[PDB]
């Protein structure tokens, strides 16, 4: 039903004016909500890990992928509410947070390309869908074209995505040159013994992984995440991560991988010690993505990782989405707005935040202790259930390096708190205009999932016991 949305939408956007664009996104927001509500019941198809293959050995549908599908729709309902709703009714925030005409077009085409990977069985479905989502990230980066940094970032992202698309294509055709086959379904655990498919499947994994931000090739993605504006970057950070990783976690082609294990160690090291002496908030906030994409590369080495993965996915997605939404709200309280596309940059700009909207600091605290892994919060059971899979399966040096990486990464997480709970000379006493009710309810909902979401751990596991076993 994304197809019908795109086909209806681009015809509808061709006829609307510029001033209509905002309200169009509101429509699409509600549309996606009634694809969650009125169409969820398809989970009843997937009892006892019954898997389907649709369109003839082409798309594989299990309930792992159904959950990834539902997660991607939920986060788009959020991101679409960020574009489609005003923050305040000022003359300021209309020229700072304003959608383009064709923005929601590229959004839905991107989600289409990201779903056709997690649902994918074939390799040409994999390649066409990676190409579709890669074009969409090209154009979502370059759509705010009256910005020097965003155009430079779109060009950088074009060439570095072109190399790692031709590396994937070379790995697919290298796999074809030794097996007249397109599926990893053909592998079926006898062939891997008598066939040297190490170097092929590992090179395929790498060419898929370097697009995430794994650490030998991590600098260019941190540059794109700092150069893009503040609304584009909470989408292009989240979507290729969860799409490409839930591809590679579903098909288990790097087990006992020594190369994935080196790159997981190297990722947890230079992500935690990378973002220490840094002063820009999107930088600081983009090396948090490097370490938390490091905790996934561990699970690639695993067999049977579908609990640790999915729980830590929706953990990172809610925590991610919430900490980006908080520093949208701190823009009213800063004393200095530069750079219209990216209005808050330096992390010392949110300094007096406890004396002006103290419960924004309560919100910020609750989400940032969840990144560290504090046990009343939902981030801790995510790190816990990763640890239960790492220690089960023989990765003992990986585990202590995970722990040292978590301890180093707590420093620049707590730097946000250190800066936020400080004295400020000039405090706000009263504000005329207040924040959007339907948009601040989303942040309150995203906290109450993080705070009081350890409640349902038991229920989820029992539901997890039925539909995946």
């Amino acid at each position: 039903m994304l197809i019908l949305a795109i086909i209806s939408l681009i015809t509808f956007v061709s006829m609307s004016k510029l001033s209509d664009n905002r309200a169009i996104i509101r429509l699409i927001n509600i549309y996606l909500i009634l694809v969650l509500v009125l169409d969820s019941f398809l989970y009843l198809l997937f009892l006892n890990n019954q898997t389907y293959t649709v369109m003839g050995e082409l798309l594989i549908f299990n309930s792992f992928t159904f959950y990834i599908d539902m997660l991607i729709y939920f986060i788009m309902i959020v991101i679409s509410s960020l574009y489609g709703y005003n923050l305040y009714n000022n003359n300021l925030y209309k020229t700072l947070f304003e959608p383009k005409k064709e923005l929601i077009i590229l959004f839905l085409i991107n989600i289409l390309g990201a779903l056709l990977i997690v649902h994918s069985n074939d390799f040409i479905t994999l390649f066409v869908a990676i190409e579709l989502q890669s074009y969409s990230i090209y154009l979502i980066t370059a759509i705010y074209n009256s910005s020097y940094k965003a155009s430079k970032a779109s060009m950088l992202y074009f060439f570095m995505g072109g190399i790692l698309s031709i590396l994937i294509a070379y790995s697919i055709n290298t796999y074809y040159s030794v097996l007249n086959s397109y599926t990893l379904h053909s592998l079926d655990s006898l062939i891997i013994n008598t066939l040297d498919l190490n170097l092929i499947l590992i090179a395929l994994s790498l060419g898929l992984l370097f697009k995430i931000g794994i650490a030998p090739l991590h600098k260019w993605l941190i540059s794109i995440y700092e150069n893009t504006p503040i609304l584009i970057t909470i989408y292009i950070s989240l979507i290729p991560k969860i799409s490409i990783l839930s591809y590679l976690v579903l098909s288990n082609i790097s087990i006992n991988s020594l190369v994935i294990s080196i790159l997981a160690i190297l990722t947890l090291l230079v992500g935690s010690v990378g973002g220490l002496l840094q002063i820009k908030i999107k930088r600081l906030l983009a090396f948090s993505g490097l370490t938390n994409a490091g905790y996934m590369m561990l699970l690639l080495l695993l067999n049977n990782n579908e609990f640790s993965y999915l729980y830590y996915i929706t953990q990172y997605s809610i925590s991610h989405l919430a900490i980006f939404m908080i520093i949208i709200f701190s823009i009213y309280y800063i004393n200095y707005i530069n750079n219209q596309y990216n209005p808050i940059i330096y992390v010392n700009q949110l300094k007096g935040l406890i004396h002006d909207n103290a419960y924004l600091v309560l919100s910020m605290a609750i989400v940032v202790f969840s990144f560290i892994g504090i046990p009343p919060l939902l981030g801790f059971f995510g790190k816990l259930n990763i640890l239960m899979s790492i220690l089960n399966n023989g990765y003992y040096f990986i585990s202590i390096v995970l722990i040292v990486a978590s301890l180093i990464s707590a420093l620049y997480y707590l730097y946000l708190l250190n800066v936020s709970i400080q004295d400020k000379n000039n405090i706000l006493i009263n504000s005329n205009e207040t924040v959007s009710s339907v948009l601040s309810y989303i942040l309150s909902s995203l906290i109450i999932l993080i705070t009081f979401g350890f409640i349902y751990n038991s229920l989820i596991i029992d539901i997890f016991n039925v539909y995946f076993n």
Partner: protein
């Protein structure tokens, strides 16, 4: 419907007291004092004749996520007490109004924040002693640290920032390896539980690995010599209630965790390693109590004193003796009485008045404050191991139990009675005597609230000192429980 209507009534009454009174601190005192009444009524209905866990309740079960659960299948979070838990709960709950008392006029700017954080820390360390899973012990073991970080950072000395960092850092960094060991237990046994876990046997090569991860966390939290490092600065730059709740309750929480978590299922490990514990225990009694002598600051001395007393305490735990276990419990409870009174004397009566904690300013406090000097001496002598105070009962039975298991370690462990007296009386005679200091202008005598806190925390040492049998009715099961003499 009944227990929901109680909460819908009490939250409404809370909102109304907020709307009409700006502070809450009256309602917080009222709530913590009611918690006292409730826990002592639980003490009346407590059966001492059963080794069992008497008052059990499950939270967050599958079939009932919001509330109590009566099902044939349990995967939530278990809670309940024996005698051994309940003693600390008593020592917990009578401390909780006093810290809520302890800052009744100091904090002016943001009252409701500070008193909410202090009461919330106290409630978390209430529920620490109720827990029965390994995970439900550990979830609340680390619920304290955001509240401690926010408390030490916002309020404190000029150096609030580094102290709040260290109380996150070292405490976290030890607790992570504790979690590693908990995970390795939870994937072998497939059950975290404080009930069954003495029944299971692990391999000696497998107990050999698990025990390091728990023991280095207890090395961090009862500060033994390799990491005894955050303790003086997180005291010396704390506010008052954070320092009291820390040194009265968190250190005894890790003294409880070495009993509850390690001595039941690491027994055959534990015998192979008692000399390593005795190395580190003697070496943290000698070398921290010797570093007390060269100190310029005044809250820092009572901090290193707490290190030396916990170093005495843990060699009764690992003593494999009835005497040592009972002496460690009576030391832990009596130090939880006597030590927050000392942090009051340095922090409440002496930092609220002069706002500088350097020792060199303070001389001849007797001639302008006689009854403060009276306190300073009788709380000094209660700290050393001067008897009829309960601190000596803990020190004596702990040194005796440590002399059982290895006599030569007890021979040099016994000189702690000397080393604990040197710095404490060296501080006491500098504060008590001399011509009154030219730097200090004369201020008020000790008020009624401070004398109230002091009188309670001194009677409660003297009752345990005159008769330590008053709480043997809880422990006589749990003194026999942890002993492994084949």
């Amino acid at each position: 419907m009944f227990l929901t209507s109680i909460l819908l009534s009490s939250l409404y009454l809370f909102n109304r007291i907020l709307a009409w009174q700006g502070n809450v601190k009256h309602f917080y005192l009222f709530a913590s004092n009611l918690l006292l009444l409730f826990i002592v009524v639980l003490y009346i209905n407590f059966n001492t004749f059963s080794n069992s866990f008497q008052f059990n309740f499950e939270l967050f079960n599958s079939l009932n996520p919001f509330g109590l659960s009566n099902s044939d299948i349990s995967n939530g979070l278990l809670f309940g007490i024996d005698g051994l838990s309940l003693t600390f709960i008593l020592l917990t709950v009578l401390l909780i109004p006093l810290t809520l008392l302890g800052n009744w006029y100091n904090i002016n700017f943001n009252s409701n924040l500070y008193y909410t954080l202090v009461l919330a820390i106290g409630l978390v360390i209430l529920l620490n002693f109720w827990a029965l899973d390994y995970i439900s012990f550990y979830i609340l073991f680390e619920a304290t640290l955001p509240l401690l970080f926010i408390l030490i950072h916002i309020y404190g000395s000029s150096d609030s920032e580094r102290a709040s960092f260290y109380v996150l850092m070292f405490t976290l960094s030890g607790s992570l390896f504790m979690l590693l060991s908990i995970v390795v237990i939870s994937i072998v046994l497939n059950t975290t539980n404080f009930i069954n876990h003495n029944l299971f046997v692990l391999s000696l090569d497998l107990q050999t690995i698990i025990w390091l991860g728990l023991f280095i966390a207890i090395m961090v939290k009862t500060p033994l010599f390799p990491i005894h490092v955050w303790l003086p600065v997180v005291h010396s730059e704390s506010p008052l209630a954070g320092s009291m709740i820390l040194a009265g309750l968190i250190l005894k929480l890790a003294l409880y965790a070495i009993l509850r978590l390690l001595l039941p299922l690491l027994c055959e490990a534990q015998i192979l390693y008692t000399p390593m514990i005795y190395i580190i225990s003697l070496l943290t009694i000698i070398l921290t109590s010797l570093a007390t002598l060269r100190q310029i600051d005044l809250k820092v001395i009572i901090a290193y004193s707490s290190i030396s007393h916990m170093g005495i305490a843990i060699l009764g735990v690992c003593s494999n003796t009835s005497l040592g276990i009972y002496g460690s419990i009576v030391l832990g409870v009596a130090h939880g009485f006597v030590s927050p009174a000392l942090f009051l004397i340095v922090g409440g009566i002496l930092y609220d008045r002069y706002h500088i904690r350097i020792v060199n300013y303070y001389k001849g406090l007797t001639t302008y404050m006689p009854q403060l000097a009276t306190y300073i001496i009788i709380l000094s002598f209660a700290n050393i191991g001067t008897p009829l105070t309960g601190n000596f009962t803990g020190e004596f039975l702990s040194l005796q139990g440590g002399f059982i298991r290895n006599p030569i370690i007890g021979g040099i462990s016994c000189i702690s009675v000397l080393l604990a007296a040197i710095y404490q009386l060296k501080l006491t005679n500098k504060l008590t005597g001399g011509i009154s200091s030219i730097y200090m202008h004369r201020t008020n005598d000790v008020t009624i609230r401070e004398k109230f806190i002091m009188n309670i925390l001194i009677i409660s040492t003297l009752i345990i000192g005159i008769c330590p049998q008053i709480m043997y009715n809880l422990l006589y099961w749990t003194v026999n429980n942890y002993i492994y003499i084949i």
